[PDB]
Design a binder for this molecule. Structure first.
Ligand code: C5P
Length: 393
């Protein structure tokens, strides 16, 4: 009998956790492994250090049929150790269940580990408030039972169905916020149901790795030594969170770069509404899709250190390298931050948010307020901030 480990995630946070798992186990060069991590390209010179390492694409949040070709290479008794994104867990496991059903005499499921996509799961759970959660749970377990057979998907409640895997397999959920589950009154039947099958997502695994493994992990996640060192400087640090564009009544991208620079000044300069303090070392963390806007911001900002835009913000939490303060344009990344690290979150114009009032009603912001992670005073609408100049370098 042999174990095969599958690492599936279309997004970022689960993949970052899954790459940690792989790193933790990286002394084993031959354990069969299947990577379907859409956002992460494992470098060739890491891959060739391993045997029985396989790669699969995801298509509409499902591993392609190329998964069957890989699994056919192991014709004896196999046990699958599966790692999933919670939000997308149903779609991700479909081809696995189909395969198991075909080969139920020799293929079996060892266990599941499931990790939050991020704020998504929480936003989706809020929509379930005022349903009979106990009733939703039991129904989802029943419908999961049929899915288990054939690999046929039908769930009346797709959100709750994410949380009933324990009715079929050994499972461990890794939650961004256990406080959410323990404090949300309406979710008490779900929290009680999950029993000891969940834990808070651990951000400390990196500290127990060998130095060699730590470097391996950083390589996996596109975090080079220059950037790490910059984030090891023994001084107070502030990271500004850049964005792409918004509804500014212009399609001139230089405008959006200019305005983001104005927002940054409100943190860096004493004259700013949001002045962080004179003693902070300042960093710019551009949006991964900012493109040439990031170049403009970097070029015009003074006394600032770039953190390559392509790195997922959550890598910082994963590696213990979060700064003292984080501020700037709003992103779901704020959901995952300890409250003492949040300065001010600035919201830009879109269809849903045209004011501070609207920003306070943003789905992840509302949860954050209720959990006491942020005060209303920490929520700023972008065009409330006057034009200010920057400093000298
Ligand atoms: N300045 C920024 C903004 C977003 N991001 C990343 O992009 C992801 C998606 O952000 P949004 O939900 O705000 O679109 C986050 O999980 C975060 O990793 C980043 O790494 N740096």
């Amino acid at each position: 009998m042999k174990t095969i480990t599958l690492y599936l995630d279309p997004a970022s946070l689960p993949a970052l956790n899954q790459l940690m798992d792989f790193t933790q186990n990286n002394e084993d060069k031959t354990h069969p492994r299947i990577f379907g991590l859409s956002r992460f390209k494992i470098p060739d010179n890491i891959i060739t250090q391993y045997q029985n390492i396989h790669f699969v694409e995801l298509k509409d949040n499902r591993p392609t049929e190329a998964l069957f070709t890989i699994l056919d290479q192991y014709p004896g008794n196999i046990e699958l150790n599966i790692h999933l994104n919670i939000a997308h867990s149903v779609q991700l496991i479909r081809p696995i269940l189909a395969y198991r059903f075909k080969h139920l005499d020799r293929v079996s499921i060892q266990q599941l580990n499931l990790y939050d996509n991020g704020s998504m799961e929480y936003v989706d759970l809020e929509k379930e408030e005022n349903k009979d959660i106990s009733a939703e749970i039991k129904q989802a377990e029943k419908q999961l039972s049929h899915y288990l057979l054939t690999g046929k998907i039908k769930f009346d409640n797709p959100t709750i169905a994410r949380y009933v895997w324990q009715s079929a397999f050994p499972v461990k959920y890794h939650f961004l916020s256990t406080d959410y589950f323990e404090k949300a009154e309406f979710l008490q039947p779900l929290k009680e149901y999950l029993a000891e099958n969940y834990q808070k997502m651990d951000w400390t695994a990196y500290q127990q790795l060998t130095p060699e493994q730590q470097a391996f992990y950083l390589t996996l996640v596109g975090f080079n030594d220059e950037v790490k060192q910059s984030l090891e400087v023994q001084q107070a640090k502030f990271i500004f969170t850049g964005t792409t564009t918004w509804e500014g009544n212009t399609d001139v991208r230089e405008y959006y770069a200019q305005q983001q620079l104005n927002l940054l000044n409100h943190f860096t300069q004493a004259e700013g509404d949001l002045f962080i303090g004179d003693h902070y070392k300042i960093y710019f963390k551009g949006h991964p899709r900012g493109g040439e806007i990031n170049d403009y911001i970097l070029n015009n900002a003074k006394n600032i250190t770039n953190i390559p835009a392509n790195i997922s913000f959550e890598v910082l939490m994963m590696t213990g390298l979060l700064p003292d303060k984080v501020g700037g344009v709003a992103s779901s990344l704020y959901f995952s931050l300890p409250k003492e690290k949040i300065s001010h979150i600035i919201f830009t114009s879109n269809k849903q948010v045209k004011s501070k009032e609207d920003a306070l009603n943003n789905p992840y912001v509302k949860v954050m307020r209720r959990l006491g992670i942020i005060d209303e005073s920490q929520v700023i609408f972008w065009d409330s901030l006057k034009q200010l100049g920057g400093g000298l370098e």
